Ligand binder design. Sequence first.
Ligand SMILES: O=C(NCCc1ccc(F)cc1)c1ccco1
Lengths: 172, 171
Amino acid sequence: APPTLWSRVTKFGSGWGFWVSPTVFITTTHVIPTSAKEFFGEPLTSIAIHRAGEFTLFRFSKKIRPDLTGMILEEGCPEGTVCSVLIKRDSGELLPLAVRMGAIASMRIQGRLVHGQSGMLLTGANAKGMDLGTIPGDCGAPYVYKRANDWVVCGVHAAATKSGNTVVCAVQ
Amino acid sequence: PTLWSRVTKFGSGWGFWVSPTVFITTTHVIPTSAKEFFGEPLTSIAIHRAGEFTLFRFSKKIRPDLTGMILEEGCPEGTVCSVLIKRDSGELLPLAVRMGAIASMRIQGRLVHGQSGMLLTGANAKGMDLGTIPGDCGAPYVYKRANDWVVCGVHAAATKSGNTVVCAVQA
Ligand SMILES: O=C(NCCc1ccc(F)cc1)c1ccco1
């Protein structure tokens, strides 16, 4: 995946978030520190927060990442799209995990109620665990794909089943 | 302490540490001019070649941090393996592959023998991280069976813009 997608992937709370543009940052709601009153040097009063379940978007009143171009953010993707989930792991290792996307779904995972775009990993069978699958620390990692000549971001990693074969993308 | 630490840049491709003393690779990626590998003189290394599969056995522990893994001669037809690709970008690209018959195939003009497989990442990609490249040869094929990782061969060949890969196997 292009270097300019990896540069947008930012360590954040208990997981990750993603710079769509110089002013727009997306993440998974449950990774945000609940006590936090300041983000990237800006008070809450200077930030527009848009929350839909496990999808949160932050829009800043100043350019935080002026090195970036704005890219396309969509509300999930068509069934059958293959996405990459841009996961960072122990030691500057970069894991673009392949996933086949399916329907919008409501599920119960480890007792919690989860809603978003379902998908199934294309990394292996029985993918439970860090070598072929997701871990809790991956929440907030972006789902991206290439559409003709450009890249799209279409959500953030919210959950994975106990088996690890099914994942859920939170969507705008 | 990860499978991924066993995948090593070697020659014109990669290879895999099965145990502290045993390293496997694709025959065609091995240098043809060498006096040592991994700091050990070639005089002290046992080399076992079978077609596009090569196994090195060292005289001392090169990777004492590792346990020994199960190495088998390919896998049952229909097993879904992962090919553990490392890229010079720093990316790790595990790709699911449905394994088929042992066969001889003409993969871009060359006869190659080994276990055939079909990539499970779909039609092609518009340049997504979803297929192999020539630089990937020697990457291992692995799958989880009970509580054990099994390694059953190394990446030998692929059709350009196609679905078919060849896993070279022991013996
Ligand atoms: O696609 C996958 N499995 C299905 C293989 C298959 C069996 C039988 C078929 F008829 C057609 C495909 C997969 C990706 C990662 C783990 O599993």
